[PDB]
């Protein structure tokens, strides 16, 4: 029951890996082989699609129809000094040698060093007024976005120079004597 509920999310989460590899491996060879003929819209479209579809798919497989983000247990159990061929079978040759420290390195839950200063900023902007004025600002801005989508939803919804009848009247008027008396 629950294990299949984990599986139906994680299988597609690792299916997103295939699309990400198909993007990046092609990018690696096409950057080296085709550095010239610079086309900024061509790479901007690739960046736009990578931002669009991958970031939506991993989010929709990690934020809904998924096990809770604080529930499961990430457990490393086997590690050896020599190369464990199971990982190179799974990762298709990636993460080589299978060192002792690379298994703690795999669970790199520590963020970037600049994350410490942005957390310091998150403790710094709370020194001034917070969740009292900005709360009503984002409430009024949510109502403003409702007004904008209402505006969008209310905004989302030859001469006959030739005359065949007159031409057929002209071709018949001079044919015989009608319309002269």
């Amino acid at each position: 029951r629950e294990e299949k509920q984990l599986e139906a999310s994680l299988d597609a989460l690792l299916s997103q890996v295939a699309d990400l590899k198909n993007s990046l491996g092609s990018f690696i060879c096409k950057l080296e082989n085709e550095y010239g003929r610079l086309t900024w819209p061509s790479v901007l479209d690739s960046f736009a699609l990578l931002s669009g579809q991958l970031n939506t798919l991993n989010k929709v497989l990690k934020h809904e129809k998924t096990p809770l983000f604080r529930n499961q247990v990430i457990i490393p159990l086997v590690l050896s000094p020599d190369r464990d061929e199971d990982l190179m079978r799974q990762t298709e040759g990636r993460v080589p040698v299978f060192s002792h420290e690379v298994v703690p390195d795999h669970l790199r839950t520590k963020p970037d060093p600049e994350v410490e200063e942005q957390e310091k900023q998150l403790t710094t902007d709370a020194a001034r007024i917070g969740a009292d004025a900005a709360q009503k600002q984002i409430q009024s801005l949510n109502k403003m976005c409702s007004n904008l989508l209402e505006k969008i939803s209310k905004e989302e919804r030859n001469k006959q120079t030739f005359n065949p009848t007159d031409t057929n009247a002209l071709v018949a008027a001079v044919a015989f004597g009608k319309g002269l008396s």
């Binding site: 600002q137 009024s140 403003m144 904008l148 505006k151 905004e155």
Partner: protein, 54 residues
């Protein structure tokens, strides 16, 4: 024979005014207080229908 190049200049140099129309829409939008909501709405409607007359 300069009439159609004048029409093309009307197509081109309107787009600066279109940029200013979008800017005047969004700056009045990000304002917390908007007494002239009619000005904002007519800026948006003018930007919508003016690309259409272009």
């Amino acid at each position: 024979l300069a009439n159609e190049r004048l029409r093309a200049l009307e197509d081109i140099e309107r787009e600066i005014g279109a940029i200013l129309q979008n800017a005047g829409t969004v700056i009045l939008e990000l304002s917390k207080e908007k007494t002239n909501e009619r000005l904002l709405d007519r800026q948006a409607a003018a930007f919508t229908a003016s690309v259409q007359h272009v």
